[PDB]
Amino acid sequence: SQSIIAYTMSLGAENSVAYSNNSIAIPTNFTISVTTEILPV
Amino acid sequence: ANQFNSAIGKIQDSLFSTASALGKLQDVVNHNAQALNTLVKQLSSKFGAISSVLNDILSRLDPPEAEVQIDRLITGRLQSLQTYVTQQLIRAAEIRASANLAATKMSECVLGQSKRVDFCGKGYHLMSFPQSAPHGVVFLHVTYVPAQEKNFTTAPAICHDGKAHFPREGVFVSNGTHWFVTQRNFYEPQIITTDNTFVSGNCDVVIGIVNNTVYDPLQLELDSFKEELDKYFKNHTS
Amino acid sequence: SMTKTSVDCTMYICGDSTECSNLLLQYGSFCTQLKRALTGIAVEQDKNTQEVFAQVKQIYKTPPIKYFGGFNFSQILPDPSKPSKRSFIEDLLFNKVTLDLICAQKFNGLTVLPPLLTDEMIAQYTSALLAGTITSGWTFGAGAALQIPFAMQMAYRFNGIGVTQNVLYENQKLIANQFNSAIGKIQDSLFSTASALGKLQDVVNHNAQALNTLVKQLSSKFGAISSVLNDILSRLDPPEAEVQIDRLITGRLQSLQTYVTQQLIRAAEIRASANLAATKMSECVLGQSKRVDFCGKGYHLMSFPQSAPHGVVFLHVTYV
Numbered sequence: 001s002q003s004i005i006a007y008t009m010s011l012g013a014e015n016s017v018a019y020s021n022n023s024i025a026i027p028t029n030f031t032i033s034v035t036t037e038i039l040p041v
Numbered sequence: 042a043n044q045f046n047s048a049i050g051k052i053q054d055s056l057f058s059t060a061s062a063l064g065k066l067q068d069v070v071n072h073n074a075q076a077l078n079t080l081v082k083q084l085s086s087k088f089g090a091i092s093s094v095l096n097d098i099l100s101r102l103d104p105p106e107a108e109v110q111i112d113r114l115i116t117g118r119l120q121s122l123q124t125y126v127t128q129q130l131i132r133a134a135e136i137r138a139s140a141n142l143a144a145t146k147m148s149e150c151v152l153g154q155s156k157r158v159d160f161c162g163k164g165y166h167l168m169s170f171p172q173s174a175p176h177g178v179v180f181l182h183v184t185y186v187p188a189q190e191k192n193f194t195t196a197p198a199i200c201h202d203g204k205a206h207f208p209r210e211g212v213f214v215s216n217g218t219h220w221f222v223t224q225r226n227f228y229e230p231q232i233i234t235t236d237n238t239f240v241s242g243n244c245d246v247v248i249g250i251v252n253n254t255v256y257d258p259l260q261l262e263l264d265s266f267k268e269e270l271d272k273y274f275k276n277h278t279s
Numbered sequence: 280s281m282t283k284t285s286v287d288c289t290m291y292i293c294g295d296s297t298e299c300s301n302l303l304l305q306y307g308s309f310c311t312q313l314k315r316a317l318t319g320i321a322v323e324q325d326k327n328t329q330e331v332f333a334q335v336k337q338i339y340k341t342p343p344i345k346y347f348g349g350f351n352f353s354q355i356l357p358d359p360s361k362p363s364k365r366s367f368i369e370d371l372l373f374n375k376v377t378l379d380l381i382c383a384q385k386f387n388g389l390t391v392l393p394p395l396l397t398d399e400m401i402a403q404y405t406s407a408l409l410a411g412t413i414t415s416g417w418t419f420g421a422g423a424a425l426q427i428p429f430a431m432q433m434a435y436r437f438n439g440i441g442v443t444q445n446v447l448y449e450n451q452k453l454i455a456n457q458f459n460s461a462i463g464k465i466q467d468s469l470f471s472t473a474s475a476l477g478k479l480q481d482v483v484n485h486n487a488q489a490l491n492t493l494v495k496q497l498s499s500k501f502g503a504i505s506s507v508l509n510d511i512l513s514r515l516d517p518p519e520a521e522v523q524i525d526r527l528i529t530g531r532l533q534s535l536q537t538y539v540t541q542q543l544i545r546a547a548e549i550r551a552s553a554n555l556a557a558t559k560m561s562e563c564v565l566g567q568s569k570r571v572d573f574c575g576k577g578y579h580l581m582s583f584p585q586s587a588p589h590g591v592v593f594l595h596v597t598y599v
């Protein structure tokens with residue numbers, strides 16, 4: 001059974017970047033993304 | 042090519058399934074239709090007159106007494122027209138701003154490659170393709186997204202012979218034992234060389250500099266043939 | 280964004296008066312139009328705030344050690360010793376810009392709707408943007424946040440303005456000291472040199488003045504014997520009352536239409552400002568801009584966002 005529920009907004013996932021003093025993250029792959037933007041003219 | 046084909050195939054579903062946008066064009070259409078409907082429905086308001094029909098007032102009254110009802114209807118309908126035209130002007134200004142943005146996006150994403158962040162989609166903009174939509178435009182933004190990041194140790198400079206070496210274009214990285222130089226957006230480790238680096242000062246200024254060997258191909262060939270020349274001279278003399 | 284306002288037409292024009300409401304029914308759908316316009320303005324205000332501040336996929340956090348190559352971000356980093364985890368600069372901005380008149384405005388059909396995102400949520404978004412930009416450079420804006428030492432990121436930025444990275448690596452202490460001095464002077468120059476920060480107060484003053492004028496227009500007779508509906512209803516028969524009631528209805532309807540039109544124009548201006556702010560957040564905070572004077576005077580290095588009442592503050596770090 002479903003009901004109407006009220007909640008506080010989640011702004012997104014919490015991500016603690018592994019920032020360090022001499023540490024770097026470098027991508028070994030890539031993705032080709034095709035996104036869409038609709039604009040009234 | 043396979044990734045682009047997959048994404049462009051998924052576009053035909055995500056355009057109408059994920060919603061998000063494409064409700065802007067329908068919102069424009071709905072706003073215009075609702076404004077016209079309100080304007081044409083305002084003709085049924087009496088605005089204080091005996092009737093909202095002009096023929097009824099003209100048929101049931103003399104011009105002296107008719108004029109009052111006619112003036113009430115005129116005032117009401119003139120107010121309705123003025124309201125409609127003002128809302129139309131404001132909506133036209135909004136649509137003009139949207140169209141200026143769309144023309145800028147056509148110039149800078151379709152006719153070129155943009156360095157502006159998030160102007161032509163999320164990620165590093167590669168290209169864009171225009172499509173026509175009712176009263177609007179659709180931009181298919183093809184972007185590059187780094188995917189599989191790996192962890193590396195990094196240094197700002199490399200110290201070899203009392204000289205600080207900096208990468209010409211890239212970043213110094215280490216898996217733990219060996220030091221390479223790679224391009225900053227894609228892992229392609231190369232042996233640190235005088236060709237990939239430039240020298241600037243000594244190793245007493247840069248914070249975080251590490252010793253690592255910077256190889257010189259010229260000196261390698263030079264001393265490699267120098268050893269052979271020394272052997273030749275040794276065998277010739279004795 | 281600006282204040283979201285809701286107006287009850289029947290309360291404003293014909294407050295708890297049935298005769299006046301029955302007369303107002305004769306004017307058609309003007310008030311449904313006004314209600315729709317105000318609802319659109321409010322939804323647009325929420326959209327403005329979301330488009331400016333919700334530019335991060337994840338709520339990025341800064342590591343417990345606050346060393347970034349000698350740079351001093353504590354005045355713009357969140358303060359955990361606060362109910363709302365605002366920074367020093369953000370707390371100053373919220374204290375100096377401040378939003379009976381309110382009771383009277385609420386007393387005749389004019390209510391104020393709270394924004395969807397609380398100031399705590401906006402501060403959280405700003406904190407995530409700051410953590411992303413000082414832990415991962417411009418990588419978090421194009422995908423996953425890739426960590427990089429802050430000195431190396433600053434070397435990348437120096438390369439992006441035409442200066443070799445050895446210059447920054449050999450003047451790192453001087454550059455950190457200069458940035459620290461400038462960010463320290465920010466806390467004084469933001470409120471002493473004035474210039475801007477009057478825009479937010481101007482928005483607040485314009486909205487308050489518009490609401491005050493709307494609620495003051497209820498004291499105008501508009502040619503009627505009285506501006507009080509109860510007086511007219513108590514001193515006249517419905518035939519003779521209807522004339523005064525119609526005069527008051529016309530005057531108050533004109534006042535409402537004027538208020539809604541000015542609100543629409545001001546909302547368009549605020550929407551343009553918010554689109555500009557979203558573009559600046561994308562192109563100055565999430566990246567390094569080559570556009571001249573778009574992210575400050577000089578060669579843009581980086582930018583930092585801060586939340587302010589109904590607005591955003593961009594601290595542009597440039598090379599001169």
Ligand SMILES: *[C@@H]1O[C@H](CO[C@@H]2O[C@@H](C)[C@@H](O)[C@@H](O)[C@@H]2O)[C@@H](O[C@@H]2O[C@H](CO)[C@@H](O)[C@H](O)[C@H]2NC(C)=O)[C@H](O)[C@H]1NC(C)=O
Pocket residue numbers: 200251252
């Ligand atoms: C980075 O190297 C310097 C330079 O040392 C020289 O080059 C090295 C690759 C190796 O071959 C050394 O034997 C060479 O001397 C290091 O400076 C040395 O520091 C030690 C410890 O204090 C000292 O005994 C040496 O005399 C120094 N050498 C010189 C030429 O002054 C430096 O410590 C190295 N840094 C790290 C973090 O290992």
Ligand SMILES: *[C@@H]1O[C@H](CO)[C@@H](O[C@@H]2O[C@H](CO)[C@@H](O)[C@H](O)[C@H]2NC(C)=O)[C@H](O)[C@H]1NC(C)=O
Pocket residue numbers: 021346
């Ligand atoms: C990153 O390097 C910095 C700069 O040296 C380190 O910060 C120093 O840490 C030591 C060790 O406790 C302290 O004595 C110094 O006072 C710190 N200096 C400053 C300016 O804060 C930092 O600890 C290093 N990071 C790691 C993970 O070791």
Ligand SMILES: *[C@@H]1O[C@H](CO)[C@@H](O[C@@H]2O[C@H](CO)[C@@H](O)[C@H](O)[C@H]2NC(C)=O)[C@H](O)[C@H]1NC(C)=O
Pocket residue numbers: 028029030043044189
């Ligand atoms: C980089 O990413 C691509 C795309 O995800 C990988 O190609 C996939 O490889 C797996 C394993 O062989 C296959 O099952 C998938 O079908 C491939 N996908 C596509 C779209 O071709 C590729 O292997 C990755 N390369 C590296 C070096 O990590």
Ligand SMILES: *[C@@H]1O[C@H](CO)[C@@H](O)[C@H](O)[C@H]1NC(C)=O
Pocket residue numbers: 018025190191192
């Ligand atoms: C790098 O190392 C840190 C610390 O162990 C870890 O949290 C982080 O996930 C690693 N990053 C990647 C991309 O694997």
Ligand SMILES: *[C@@H]1O[C@H](CO)[C@@H](O)[C@H](O)[C@H]1NC(C)=O
Pocket residue numbers: 216217218219
């Ligand atoms: C680092 O790369 C080098 C060169 O390929 C390799 O020989 C070495 O094993 C690597 N180190 C580690 C720990 O993987």
Ligand SMILES: *[C@@H]1O[C@H](CO)[C@@H](O)[C@H](O)[C@H]1NC(C)=O
Pocket residue numbers: 351352353354459463
């Ligand atoms: C960092 O910022 C705060 C705020 O100005 C300052 O008081 C503090 O001393 C700074 N720390 C350093 C090490 O400069």
